[PDB]
Amino acid sequence: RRRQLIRQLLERDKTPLAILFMAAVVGTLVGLAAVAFDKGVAWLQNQRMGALVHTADNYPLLLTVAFLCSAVLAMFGYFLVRKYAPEAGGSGIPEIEGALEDQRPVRWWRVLPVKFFGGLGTLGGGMVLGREGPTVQIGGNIGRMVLDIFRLKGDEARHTLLATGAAAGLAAAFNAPLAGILFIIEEMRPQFRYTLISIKAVFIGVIMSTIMYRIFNHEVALIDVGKLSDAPLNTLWLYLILGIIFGIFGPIFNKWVLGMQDLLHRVHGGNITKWVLMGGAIGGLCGLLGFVAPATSGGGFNLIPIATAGNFSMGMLVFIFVARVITTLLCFSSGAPGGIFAPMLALGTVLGTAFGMVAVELFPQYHLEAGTFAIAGMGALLAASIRAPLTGIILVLEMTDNYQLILPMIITGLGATLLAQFTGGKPLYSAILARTLAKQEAE
Amino acid sequence: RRQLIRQLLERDKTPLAILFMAAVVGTLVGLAAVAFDKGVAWLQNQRMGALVHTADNYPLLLTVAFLCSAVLAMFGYFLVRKYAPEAGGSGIPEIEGALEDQRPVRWWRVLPVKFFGGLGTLGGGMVLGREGPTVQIGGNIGRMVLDIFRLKGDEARHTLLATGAAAGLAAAFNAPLAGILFIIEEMRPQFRYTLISIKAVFIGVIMSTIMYRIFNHEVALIDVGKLSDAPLNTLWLYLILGIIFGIFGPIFNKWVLGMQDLLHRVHGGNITKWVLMGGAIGGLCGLLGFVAPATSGGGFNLIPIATAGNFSMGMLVFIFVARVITTLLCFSSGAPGGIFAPMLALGTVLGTAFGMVAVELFPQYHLEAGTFAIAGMGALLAASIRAPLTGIILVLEMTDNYQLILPMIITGLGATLLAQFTGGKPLYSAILARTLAKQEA
């Protein structure tokens, strides 16, 4: 096979011009789509805010229209999914992951409006879910859409355009282009065999998508954390210890989301009415908690700078962590459309800060800043539960811009993945696609 | 399908034996990289002090400059030709071949040959990079412990050989991310499936970097400061720059390939004609490394100076031309040493050139030429080696100007696109092919 290789080597990186151009098209659309979605969620959270002021005196009445507004919006989200596109519930990343293995269908004519408006409700209602869930699955379907429209033929085009769509979706959700491309080549793409996903083309989509986001969302970062302090060599062992903590909690959190999928499935049994009602109950709880304790509900991007800056007490940190574990599980294991990335960044930050605080008092000779352990533990739950550390690290790096902490971020993130494996944990996205694939045969 | 459902549930369960050994490989590749780095620095230092010993007789001083680097070069070419011919040139294509199981990893030979052979060419101040030695060494270090502990399996052989190459790039630039990204974008078997545990490559890259940090902290290879931001209406200039790199990339690619040929006629394959030609080239660098140091050496020294715009346009053009010459002469001669570093310097200079023109044509954009230098810095890496995602993350890790990520990506991709469309080829893959085809003919 030496003679095949010599031929192959000389023919390396010559992606078909038709694929490159369409990748630029997919990226732009996924970009505009993600911006539109982001503008929609913001508007709804804003109306709900304005409604609570309309009745800002009668506290029991105000606690109600908080609930109902998010309850109604939640129900509308669960319903759009159950009735028109059941595959558009939950994260959406496992579904696009399956579509790359050619084992799941990309029904773009249905999921595009279902996910966009269904997620618009769950997110707009202030449930503990992330934007990447919608944007990635939408992005993947946008990729499939132009494939069918322009009738491009081949596995390369199908696999590529479906990949650049998912990548341009994650990148436009975080303003993180590198994390988007890195997600495709570490987690998304077919993991157990070869594939023809042109990386150069995945880039072009991610660029155009990011450029679209930059045109409509510039000047205001999702997470501003400032330039933190550096990390001395003799302080590194503290980050490994932190990673080991995430490493044994990761798999545990993984079981809970899986098990809570089951327990919540008994409440409705599969019935479209019991489910939608259960959704509004959960959704209504979040919009309520999003007024009496806003750190326990919502995406989580708001309490990240606050936690890093050490403006929370240890009592508040413990409270927020427990309360968010609950509302994260309740929201993601319910089947509502929405990703789990963003609330796992928040969970990781809080826990990291908690470790950072104890680290500060036990070791004043290290001159520690608890905000360094928050950034280190920020993409750690992504590492111990999702088991894609290289993506989670570059994601955090792209959002916090604290490169002088790259070693603690890596050391913690890897201690997470090591202990997640060694304690019998499984990739949450892959352990879901298997649960979905195996039930498609169980029945 | 039921196979997939089985595979999914068994995803990321890298054997603990492979993980532990990866930590060992990285540590060794780390220390080895550190020691190599300390060696090269020492020799460049001695030559410096010897020029002071005779800092009056200008003709005499121009000589002991030549000779010191000339002799050191000769010792380098000889160590390669006599004991490990595969340890000449970059060394990256060689490890790349090893991953395809199409080249042998003779670690018992290459380790001392490359370490000391590179110690001469680099220490002589030739236009070569540290990653050549460190990556190839790192791969063989990885192969070494595989053999020593007698680990069995393709996974172990493929992984340990990869973590070693990654941990060698990482310990050469203090760039852990670019190290891991290099394996999964360029190094690993590109046309079929493989069993390279990414988690294990990480562990090696960490421990290697940690070793580098223990002996080289507080002083960055490239300090450039925090540059200005890049407005949205300024992005088209970066695509234009990438287009320029995109057409020069393939051209430079032909020249390095062609100069390999022409320099092979001078010695014909003879070990003596070669080594003597080596000291001629190597002696030129140590000479040029005194009368115009910007035209010789790795290049990391003129990078901050160029970005800060402390060069004139006249000097910039000179430096670019004079470095195209001394880069080809050094890498196409077969001397041990990587071509990454001198391509970063080539990309920086061309970028600053484009930046300066941009500044005067567009005062309404309020431009800083140092932004185009950082954009163009990993552009030659993109248009010639054709690994843009690694080149971008490499520059990012070394310059720490993340607020320029869009220009860096737009330029880097405008390089790879035009490199393809103008019939260019991956220089590292266009070499492994040249080497594999002379093997079956």
Side-chain angles (χ1 to χ4, degrees):
Chain A
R1 50 173 301 275
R2 173 195 298 171
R3 206 144 54 259
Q4 183 187 19
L5 193 63
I6 298 171
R7 158 63 173 175
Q8 283 180 324
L9 293 183
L10 293 163
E11 286 300 290
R12 181 167 169 264
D13 193 37
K14 292 182 64 181
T15 306
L17 183 135
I19 287 185
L20 296 174
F21 182 88
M22 293 299 148
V25 172
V26 172
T28 307
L29 302 194
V30 178
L32 300 181
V35 176
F37 180 87
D38 184 27
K39 292 287 154 292
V41 179
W43 184 85
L44 294 152
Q45 287 167 334
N46 164 77
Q47 302 301 311
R48 295 194 295 117
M49 214 76 155
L52 298 187
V53 169
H54 239 352
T55 73
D57 41 329
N58 195 335
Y59 186 78
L61 165 63
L62 139 290
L63 282 207
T64 290
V65 325
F67 186 96
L68 297 185
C69 277
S70 294
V72 170
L73 269 179
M75 297 195 312
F76 170 81
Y78 285 75
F79 167 70
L80 262 285
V81 171
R82 285 288 90 195
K83 190 74 176 182
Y84 304 93
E87 31 153 2
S91 189
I93 296 181
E95 212 70 74
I96 303 295
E97 241 172 24
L100 274 156
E101 295 280 2
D102 295 308
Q103 292 293 321
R104 294 294 285 201
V106 195
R107 321 216 304 264
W108 61 264
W109 49 94
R110 287 172 158 270
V111 178
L112 284 189
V114 165
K115 196 75 174 189
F116 184 87
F117 292 98
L120 209 41
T122 52
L123 277 250
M127 302 180 62
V128 192
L129 303 163
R131 279 165 159 75
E132 23 66 31
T135 60
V136 167
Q137 180 166 23
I138 285 183
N141 296 35
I142 295 288
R144 171 84 225 189
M145 186 187 77
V146 333
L147 178 76
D148 292 345
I149 288 187
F150 285 75
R151 297 191 191 282
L152 293 127
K153 187 178 180 175
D155 280 343
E156 187 177 25
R158 191 182 74 259
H159 282 153
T160 291
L161 289 190
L162 190 78
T164 95
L170 187 88
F174 288 140
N175 193 27
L178 296 187
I181 316 168
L182 257 294
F183 191 44
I184 257 52
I185 75 184
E186 195 211 6
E187 174 69 10
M188 297 291 291
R189 78 163 237 255
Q191 207 82 3
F192 308 90
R193 73 170 192 271
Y194 184 67
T195 13
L196 334 88
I197 308 187
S198 167
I199 269 183
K200 181 194 301 179
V202 178
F203 246 95
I204 311 191
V206 167
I207 295 185
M208 302 296 302
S209 172
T210 297
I211 291 187
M212 294 305 103
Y213 177 93
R214 293 282 245 273
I215 293 186
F216 297 83
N217 293 314
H218 49 14
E219 315 249 329
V220 189
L222 303 177
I223 292 184
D224 205 330
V225 104
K227 171 66 67 170
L228 278 270
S229 58
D230 295 21
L233 293 186
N234 68 340
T235 212
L236 294 184
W237 65 282
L238 292 178
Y239 295 104
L240 176 50
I241 288 188
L242 172 59
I244 294 174
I245 300 180
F246 273 101
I248 79 179
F249 168 74
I252 292 188
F253 181 84
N254 262 18
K255 297 179 180 177
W256 291 357
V257 46
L258 291 179
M260 204 61 53
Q261 275 180 330
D262 299 337
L263 209 157
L264 282 188
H265 189 77
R266 303 183 186 178
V267 171
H268 54 67
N271 166 266
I272 197 178
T273 292
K274 294 181 173 184
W275 200 328
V276 168
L277 286 171
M278 183 191 68
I282 296 181
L285 167 61
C286 305
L288 174 110
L289 273 180
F291 173 84
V292 313
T296 60
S297 173
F301 278 174
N302 294 314
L303 62 103
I304 293 182
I306 304 179
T308 308
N311 299 342
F312 278 145
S313 57
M314 176 108 301
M316 200 64 174
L317 286 190
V318 161
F319 167 78
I320 293 176
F321 188 81
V322 173
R324 278 195 134 265
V325 163
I326 294 184
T327 52
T328 294
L329 295 177
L330 246 53
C331 284
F332 182 70
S333 306
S334 80
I340 203 181
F341 257 59
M344 275 203 304
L345 289 166
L347 277 177
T349 302
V350 164
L351 179 56
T353 311
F355 184 89
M357 291 194 175
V358 186
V360 160
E361 74 169 35
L362 289 181
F363 309 107
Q365 65 266 29
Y366 284 159
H367 295 84
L368 292 178
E369 184 179 18
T372 48
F373 293 84
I375 284 189
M378 182 169 152
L381 233 213
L382 276 180
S385 289
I386 282 191
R387 309 279 291 274
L390 179 55
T391 288
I393 287 173
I394 298 189
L395 180 65
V396 174
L397 177 64
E398 281 205 275
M399 295 203 301
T400 60
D401 201 343
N402 268 254
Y403 179 60
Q404 27 78 19
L405 282 176
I406 191 66
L407 244 70
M409 286 197 285
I410 292 176
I411 288 166
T412 294
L414 222 66
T417 337
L418 269 184
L419 265 284
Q421 164 179 331
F422 292 159
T423 51
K426 298 187 180 182
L428 202 258
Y429 278 162
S430 295
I432 281 180
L433 185 58
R435 277 265 237 81
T436 289
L437 248 35
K439 253 181 58 184
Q440 206 185 13
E441 296 184 339
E443 62 188 62
Chain B
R1 166 187 261 206
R2 185 57 203 179
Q3 178 214 59
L4 180 62
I5 304 178
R6 156 66 178 174
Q7 289 173 315
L8 292 190
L9 295 164
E10 288 298 290
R11 183 168 168 262
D12 193 39
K13 297 183 67 175
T14 304
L16 185 134
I18 294 188
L19 294 175
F20 180 91
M21 291 298 144
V24 175
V25 176
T27 309
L28 304 187
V29 178
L31 303 175
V34 178
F36 179 87
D37 185 22
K38 293 284 154 286
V40 179
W42 185 86
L43 294 153
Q44 288 164 335
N45 168 73
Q46 304 303 313
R47 300 187 296 121
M48 216 77 160
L51 293 188
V52 169
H53 239 353
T54 72
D56 45 324
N57 196 329
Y58 185 73
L60 165 65
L61 131 293
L62 286 204
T63 288
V64 322
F66 186 96
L67 296 188
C68 279
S69 289
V71 172
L72 269 176
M74 293 195 312
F75 171 85
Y77 285 79
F78 167 68
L79 256 290
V80 174
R81 286 286 86 194
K82 191 73 171 187
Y83 304 95
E86 31 152 1
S90 184
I92 296 182
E94 210 64 70
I95 304 294
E96 236 166 31
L99 278 164
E100 295 282 4
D101 301 303
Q102 291 291 311
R103 290 297 284 207
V105 195
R106 319 213 304 261
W107 62 264
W108 51 91
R109 283 171 164 271
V110 179
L111 291 185
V113 167
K114 193 70 169 194
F115 185 90
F116 292 97
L119 218 30
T121 49
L122 274 253
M126 303 180 62
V127 191
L128 295 167
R130 280 161 158 79
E131 19 66 32
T134 59
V135 167
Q136 177 162 27
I137 286 183
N140 299 34
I141 295 285
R143 174 79 222 197
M144 185 184 80
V145 332
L146 175 75
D147 288 340
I148 287 184
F149 285 73
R150 301 190 185 277
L151 291 126
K152 184 179 181 174
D154 278 339
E155 184 178 22
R157 186 183 76 262
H158 280 147
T159 294
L160 289 192
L161 189 77
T163 83
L169 186 80
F173 289 138
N174 198 23
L177 295 190
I180 317 170
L181 258 294
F182 195 40
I183 259 51
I184 64 185
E185 196 215 7
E186 177 72 7
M187 300 290 290
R188 74 162 243 254
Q190 206 79 358
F191 307 90
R192 76 169 189 277
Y193 184 70
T194 11
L195 330 93
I196 309 188
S197 176
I198 269 185
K199 180 194 297 178
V201 178
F202 245 100
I203 311 187
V205 170
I206 294 190
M207 303 291 310
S208 167
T209 299
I210 291 190
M211 294 303 111
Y212 177 90
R213 293 282 246 273
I214 291 189
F215 297 79
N216 291 313
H217 49 16
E218 314 249 332
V219 184
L221 310 176
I222 297 180
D223 209 326
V224 104
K226 171 67 67 171
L227 275 271
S228 67
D229 291 24
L232 292 191
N233 67 339
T234 218
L235 292 186
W236 64 284
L237 299 178
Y238 290 108
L239 178 56
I240 285 187
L241 172 62
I243 288 173
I244 297 181
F245 272 98
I247 75 175
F248 168 80
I251 288 187
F252 181 84
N253 260 19
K254 293 175 180 175
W255 293 357
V256 47
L257 290 183
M259 205 62 53
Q260 276 184 326
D261 296 337
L262 208 154
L263 282 188
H264 189 80
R265 299 184 189 177
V266 172
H267 54 67
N270 168 261
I271 194 175
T272 291
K273 290 182 174 179
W274 200 324
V275 170
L276 285 168
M277 187 194 62
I281 293 177
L284 170 60
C285 301
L287 177 107
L288 276 180
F290 171 82
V291 304
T295 66
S296 168
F300 280 176
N301 293 318
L302 63 114
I303 290 180
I305 303 175
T307 310
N310 292 338
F311 280 143
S312 62
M313 176 104 295
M315 195 66 176
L316 279 189
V317 166
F318 167 81
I319 292 182
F320 187 73
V321 171
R323 275 194 137 267
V324 167
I325 296 180
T326 52
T327 292
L328 293 174
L329 246 48
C330 281
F331 182 72
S332 314
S333 75
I339 203 182
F340 258 55
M343 274 202 303
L344 292 168
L346 275 176
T348 299
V349 168
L350 180 54
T352 312
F354 185 89
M356 292 191 179
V357 185
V359 158
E360 73 174 29
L361 289 177
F362 308 110
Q364 68 261 35
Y365 283 157
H366 292 71
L367 293 173
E368 189 179 20
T371 43
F372 293 91
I374 286 187
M377 178 169 149
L380 233 211
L381 270 182
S384 291
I385 289 195
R386 308 275 290 268
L389 179 53
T390 283
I392 286 168
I393 297 189
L394 180 70
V395 173
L396 178 66
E397 285 202 279
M398 295 206 305
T399 54
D400 203 346
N401 274 254
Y402 179 61
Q403 26 80 19
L404 285 174
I405 193 68
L406 246 68
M408 290 198 291
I409 289 175
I410 283 162
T411 290
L413 224 72
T416 327
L417 271 185
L418 265 281
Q420 165 174 338
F421 292 155
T422 55
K425 291 185 182 184
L427 203 258
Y428 277 169
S429 288
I431 280 184
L432 181 60
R434 277 269 231 81
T435 296
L436 247 39
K438 269 178 52 182
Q439 174 149 103
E440 57 142 7

